[PDB]
Design a binder for these strands. Structure first.
Lengths: 260, 147, 118, 125, 186, 134, 103
RNA sequence: AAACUUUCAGCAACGGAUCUCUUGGCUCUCGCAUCGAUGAAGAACGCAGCGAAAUGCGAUACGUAAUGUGAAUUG
RNA sequence: GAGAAGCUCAGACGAGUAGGCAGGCGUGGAGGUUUGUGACGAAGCCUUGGGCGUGAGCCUGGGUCGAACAGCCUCUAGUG
RNA sequence: UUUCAAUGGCCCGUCUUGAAACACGGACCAAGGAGUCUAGCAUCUAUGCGAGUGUUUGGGUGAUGAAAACCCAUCCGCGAAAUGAAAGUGAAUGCAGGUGGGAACGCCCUUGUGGCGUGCACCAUCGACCGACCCGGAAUGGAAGGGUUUGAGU
RNA sequence: AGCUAAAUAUUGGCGAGAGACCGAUAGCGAACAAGUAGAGUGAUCGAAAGAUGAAAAGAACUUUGAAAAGAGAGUUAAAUAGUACGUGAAAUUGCUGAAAGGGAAGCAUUGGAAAUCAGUCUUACCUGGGUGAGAUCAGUAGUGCGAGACUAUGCAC
């Protein structure tokens, strides 16, 4: 917000009509450039801006807890679709399996070299290379406000126990490490786009069932929470349309194009 | 947000949607809701009848705690017991009848609306309507008053 | 791409932009209460209208029947491999001399016409 | 990534501290790496510069120029080196300043204070 | 010049749902095909109701479904009930009958009670597969004017509608203009 | 387990890495994904959606490489989902026959045969030597 | 003037309300400060419990007389029945409430 | 036919817009509680080799004692 | 196949102040993405050259210039 | 692109029934320049849940680094009952009623702008139930019987 | 009659960490020797003003001129960076070039004259014809049980 006194710290009153001057208030006195100049107007130099910004503007937005859990669950489900990861730009062409689950010994890693070696062995290091190559200086005035550099997002490591995995993986550019119990939507769908490359540990993957529960069972770590139900049982509309149950009752197919 | 506001589309139009004749001057009919009896009477009498005047007694220092008495109907009495209690007693034939404490459920009076099953049930409440008590007796249950 | 006809080649200059230097050439609709351009009096300038729209088939097409697709690197030229007969390559003005030569050689290999070549 | 609460990553604050540091701080700021032989001998990577220190320029147009540090202009963050000058219009030799990070020390001006600093850093004798 | 009055020119019906739900669009695509390739008005009705807004698709309860299909002169014994909207639960119905219900979505309590009672819950694509033309199907709707706004709509002199009141009780629009003892009664 | 291809197309029709869309010429769109052969953004041509998809790429120093999606049982195995066949330095007719046989005659994608042959011809014509005029 | 649908306006903003606008931007900071304060107290008074034992009382009025909540301190009669002196109850962390009586 | 007037373009002027920066401002959060008759805040006059404004200082005057760093200040 | 937000066929119609609605052009900043552009020259500026769009505007050739800047999907406003 | 010739072309904005006006502002150019934010209300739309709904008054993982994200309990707000000034009372005769139109569906007649059967939504209408009022009314209570009525009710 | 911590406030002062804030007519009045210059008897009022260059390497020396300066030179990646210094718009102005002009000019439609710009057309698949040379092709044979596709080994010369 701008200063409360900004544009008001001057003494100026309108000179009225008959002076062949606009009725905007003007600074009194003499002997300086500021004397006789207009003030207090949003159109005046060194005046007060129109509708000065206030601190009590609504900065925070409330979301229903059920909607937040719906979005997080959708993001987790989207992370398990290989085509969505490629759509979001993750270099996961040569990774072995989606979802990617690694042994619990990764949670005990102590060195960035070990973390890099694991990524290269599971073919997840191409995302790291992409982030490193994409690092560039920010376009615009954000570089003047502690936002000089911009880069892409790499893999999201999800762990259950922290025995050194966080410190081993944190220095790798693009890699974000989070506990399974506090999954963040900002990391699961960065920029609002689904399909984040996620690498799970065995314990975190095993605890996913208790974290989210199911449609019929309640989550152990979320009281009275059930997974959302979809409005369509099978989203393969093309298969449903071309199935025998429908094609046997439809009328004549008609002409897809008619001559003039 | 700002980018989808009507102001962005009104840019370039001199009057900004407020007309060339009447314009957008300051308050031309007064401030707030003043004038409801003289020049806003046509709006007040047709959209907010009963606005002006006095009706009823005054009660100095009203406290709503002694007046607290939420009401529940008969067709929701069996919804106040747990599911296991319903499976044990509803529709069955037992030597004892389930007790439903409406006060513990958060109600002050039991009202008679809807129907009740023929299984007997004990209803504990501070107040009960005559029709509610009659239907409970018809269903075989009893009403014992509590404090 | 064939028999391209332009309904109008004039750029629809703004009213009184010739009279005053502060008035830009970009078209603005006159909204004056006594404006003669808005009322379309005989002898005044014409206003842009939906009736001036060109044929959909020949719209956005250069006189050679192609459409100038902007290319900033080699990969943008590879995007035009299949669409050789409809899209031409327009090298971006901020592309350096080295990358411009690479773009030209790739477009020549792919058979893609280049508008700003040379 | 920085994690301490007493560390600032603000570009404005970092630039203000660097360009406003006093002479004592600027002495530490103007530091030069030691040569391969000096590093392997004293077990120290870098050391603040000092007058009469033998250095050779690594970067810039004056590459391969060896000489002793004639003066340490801490106000301008420059090192003035012997025989590293440019001719003027009138023929005078105007010295050319080199950043302390652009040179490598080949021989230290070893005094009692310098030896104490080396042992403090963890250097052998 | 042609002297033609333009009154019914632009149709006031939705040709596409306002929602951006991808699964809803998939359902719309399926029933666009069904309406085009079948001569059944049921498919057209479902497609039209798929475009409707939340207020135009009021919820229905399993008690309401049970009441409508258990009428004496109904013969809707085993027919499937279809509603383009949400099916809510009614706890006032202690015992749930066996019902076959197809709907856009089901409340967790309503779906559990239907399954426990022995019924089945189907989505619209499942309903399309089972009954491609809507044969032996009871198509239902929720009460459109059951929302709060219709208590106030049409307010005026001698209309007996609910006014927009900040609070409820005396001193709140219960004076001159509402009773004979104070000037007049509406 | 199978996530719907229609669902995937709905998610990625307007927002994915391989789409190059521009407002020029009324909003043109191009598809650059390796396993698409048409080069246009469509559900029938998007290999990220279709279980059975084909694609033609240039091969160093000559020839083409045909990329085909394997059995849908490898959907969750991206390392086993894509099969690449590097066609050797054969004549144009041999390349067309090999592509047509491996794409259409096997029942894989009988509609993409013409597109695959045309793309292979364009790649070969691009790879031909340049008769520079001085 | 008033010409639109809805209830009549009742905004109480005829004073200089913008001078006394209270923002909650320090809410997470206040939460952290209170958490650190109680952690400091717990470490200082260890191994004594962080909170003293409180009696169970019935809230007044018919709206809340069916519930049980925590009271301020035990009455003198309760301490006498339990064999605890009022001068020693405070030492061993038992609050004393002289105003409350056991009816 | 020149001169003169008007338009455009290329150079050369007047002027300081645009673009990029910023030891600055504004806003938020966190932490702390310490002026004075043992003379406060403020004012005036002076102090450096070359010092008028700023910082610092008070005839012990860009300052003394003590402590730490360790070869400069710099025109 | 033809961004089913798609393809195809056919008919009628087209003035507009105050005012209403929809779809788009342009600006600063934020998230995502583009082995995105760039000291072998980014932004900006000039132009007696070229191209596209009915239009808001956009792309490009040439000259100057010297350090950052842009396309697409969203977010946002001290946005024309 | 410049210029020539033919024809047409009044100076923009504003108030106004009416401006080219002998009505007002405007010598020129660059930069700045005016429906914003907040507490509410009303309609519409989207999302989640749904007779329930709202995690952010507060507490914890939390120290590491955590103004974020995540988790957690009791109150409470709105809604689930209205009516009367109030003391108070407080919503099923029935398939939660009948009638007419009425979506969809099923069965026939034969091609109809066809009949039969139920009948969602909505409207109109005849009733039934709750509160208030006016009655009779067989110390305290108003149970049954009513009504030309009245309520923002079932 | 009286005392008493904590949870509470904090547009002042001090220290610290930040920002979807402003980028020099903006942001505090003040990014710079700013409550300064300056005005008023006084209470008070109160500005304008950032950027050479990496480094002054800030133009030695000769010549003309009284001098200021100019011209040769010299430094630099750049003097289209010379301190009147990052780039350098418009209003306005000088020179040159083009055009027009009988008491306005400017604009629109159409064409003439002059000036300027666009085509690589006939490229590309394919084939007719000549010669050279070539590890060689149809049908096949062996190496997943029927049909079909492809790769590889050989025959077919």
């Amino acid at each position: 917000a701008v200063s409360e006194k900004a544009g008001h710290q001057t003494s100026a009153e309108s000179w009225g009509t008959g002076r062949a001057l606009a009725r905007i208030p003007r600074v009194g006195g003499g002997g300086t450039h500021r004397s006789g100049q207009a003030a207090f107007g949003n159109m005046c130099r060194s005046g007060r801006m129109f509708a000065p910004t206030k601190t009590w503007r609504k900065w925070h937005v409330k979301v229903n807890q059920n909607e937040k859990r719906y979005a997080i669950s959708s993001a987790v489900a989207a992370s398990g679709v290989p085509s969505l990861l490629l759509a979001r730009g993750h270099r996961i062409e040569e990774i072995p399996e989606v979802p990617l689950v690694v042994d619990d010994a990764v949670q005990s890693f102590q060195k960035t070299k070990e973390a890099v070696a694991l990524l290269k062995e599971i073919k997840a290091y191409r995302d790291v290379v992409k982030v490193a190559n994409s690092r560039k200086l920010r376009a615009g005035k954000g570089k003047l406000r502690n936002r000089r550099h911009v880069q892409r997002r790499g893999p999201l490591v999800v762990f259950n126990e922290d025995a050194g995995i966080v410190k081993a993986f944190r220095n790798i550019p693009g890699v974000e490490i989070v506990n399974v119990r506090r999954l963040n939507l900002l990391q699961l769908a960065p920029g609002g786009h689904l399909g984040r490359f996620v690498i799970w540990t065995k314990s975190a993957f095993g605890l996913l069932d208790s974290v989210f529960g199911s449609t019929t069972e309640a989550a152990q770590l979320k009281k009275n929470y059930f997974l959302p139900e979809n409005i369509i049982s099978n989203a393969d509309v093309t298969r449903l349309i071309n199935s025998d149950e429908i094609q046997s009752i439809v009328k004549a197919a008609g002409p897809s194009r008619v001559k003039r | 947000p700002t980018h989808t506001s009507k102001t962005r589309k009104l840019r370039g139009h001199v009057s900004a949607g407020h007309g060339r004749i009447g314009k957008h001057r300051k308050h031309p009919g007064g401030r707030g809701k003043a004038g409801g009896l003289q020049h806003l009477r046509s709006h007040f009498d047709k959209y907010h009848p009963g606005y002006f005047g006095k009706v009823g007694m005054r009660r100095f220092h009203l406290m709503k705690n002694p007046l607290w008495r939420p009401t529940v109907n008969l067709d929701r009495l069996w919804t106040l017991v747990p599911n296991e209690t319903r499976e044990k007693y509803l529709g069955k034939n037992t030597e004892v009848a389930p007790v439903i404490n409406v006060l513990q459920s958060g109600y002050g009076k039991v009202l008679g609306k809807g129907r009740l099953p023929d299984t007997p049930v004990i209803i504990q409440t501070r107040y009960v309507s005559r029709r509610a008590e009659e239907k409970i007796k018809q269903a075989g249950g009893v009403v014992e008053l509590i404090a | 791409a064939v028999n391209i006809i332009k309904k109008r080649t004039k750029p629809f200059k703004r009213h009184q932009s010739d009279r005053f230097k502060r008035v830009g050439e970009s078209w603005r609709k006159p909204r004056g209460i006594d404006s003669c351009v808005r009322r379309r009096f005989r002898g005044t300038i014409s206003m842009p209208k939906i009736g001036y729209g060109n044929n959909k088939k020949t719209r956005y097409c250069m006189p050679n029947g192609l459409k100038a697709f902007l290319v900033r690197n080699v990969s943008d030229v590879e995007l035009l491999l299949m669409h050789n007969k409809t899209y031409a390559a327009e090298i971006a003005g901020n592309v350096s001399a080295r990358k411009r030569v690479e773009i030209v050689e790739k477009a020549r290999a792919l058979g893609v016409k280049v508008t700003n070549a040379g | 990534m920085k994690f301490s609460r007493d560390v600032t990553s603000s570009r404005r604050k970092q630039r203000k501290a660097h360009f406003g540091a006093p002479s004592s701080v600027r002495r530490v700021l103007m530091s030069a790496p030691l040569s391969k032989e000096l590093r392997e001998q004293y077990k120290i990577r870098s050391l603040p510069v000092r007058r009469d220190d033998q250095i050779t320029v690594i970067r810039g147009s004056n590459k391969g120029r060896e000489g002793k540090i004639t003066s340490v202009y801490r106000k301008k963050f420059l090192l003035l080196i012997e025989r590293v000058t440019r001719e003027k219009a009138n023929g005078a030799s105007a010295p050319v300043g080199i950043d302390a990070s652009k040179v490598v020390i080949t021989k230290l001006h070893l005094d009692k204070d310098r030896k104490d600093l080396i042992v403090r850093k963890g250097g052998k004798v | 010049g042609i002297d033609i009055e333009r009154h019914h020119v632009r149709k006031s019906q939705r040709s596409k749902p306002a929602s951006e739900n991808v699964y809803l669009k998939l359902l719309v695509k399926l029933y666009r095909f069904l309406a085009r390739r079948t001569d059944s008005r049921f498919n057209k009705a479902i497609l039209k109701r798929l475009f409707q807004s939340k207020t135009n698709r009021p919820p229905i309860s399993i008690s309401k479904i049970a009441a409508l299909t258990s009428r004496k002169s109904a013969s809707l014994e085993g027919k499937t009930t279809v509603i383009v909207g949400t099916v809510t639960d009614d706890e006032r119905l202690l015992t749930v009958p066996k019902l076959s219900v197809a709907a856009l979505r089901f409340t967790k309590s309503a779906r559990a009670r239907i399954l426990k009672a022995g019924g089945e819950v189907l989505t619209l694509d499942q309903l399309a597969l089972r009954a491609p033309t809507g044969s032996n199907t009871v198509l239902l709707r929720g009460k459109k004017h059951a929302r709060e706004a219709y208590r106030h709509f049409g307010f005026g002199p001698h209309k007996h509608k609910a006014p927009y009141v900040r609070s409820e009780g005396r001193k709140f629009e219960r004076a001159r203009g509402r009773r004979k003892s104070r000037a007049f009664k509406v | 387990m199978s996530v719907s291809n229609d669902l995937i197309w709905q998610v990625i029709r307007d927002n994915n890495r391989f789409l190059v869309k521009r407002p020029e010429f009324g909003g043109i769109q191009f598809n650059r994904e390796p396993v698409n052969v048409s080069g246009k953004n469509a559900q029938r041509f998007s290999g990220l959606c279709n279980d059975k998809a084909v694609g033609v790429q240039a091969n160093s120093p000559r020839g083409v490489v045909l990329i085909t999606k394997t059995n849908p049982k490898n959907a969750q195995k991206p390392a086993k989902l894509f099969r690449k066949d590097v066609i050797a330095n054969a004549s144009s007719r041999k390349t067309y026959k090999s592509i047509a046989g491996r794409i259409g005659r096997t029942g894989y994608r009988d509609d993409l045969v013409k597109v695959s042959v045309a793309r292979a011809s364009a790649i070969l014509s691009s790879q031909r030597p340049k008769k520079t005029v001085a | 003037a008033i010409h639109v649908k809805g209830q009549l306006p009742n905004a109480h903003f005829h004073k200089d309300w913008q001078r006394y606008v209270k923002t909650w931007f320090n809410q997470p900071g206040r939460k952290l400060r209170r958490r650190q304060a109680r952690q400091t107290k717990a470490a200082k008074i260890a191994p004594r419990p962080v909170e003293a034992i409180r009696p169970a009382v019935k809230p007044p009025t018919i709206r809340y007389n069916m519930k049980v909540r925590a009271g301020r301190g035990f009455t003198l009669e309760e301490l006498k029945a339990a064999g605890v002196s009022r001068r020693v109850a405070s030492t061993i962390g038992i609050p004393v409430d002289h105003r409350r009586r056991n009816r």
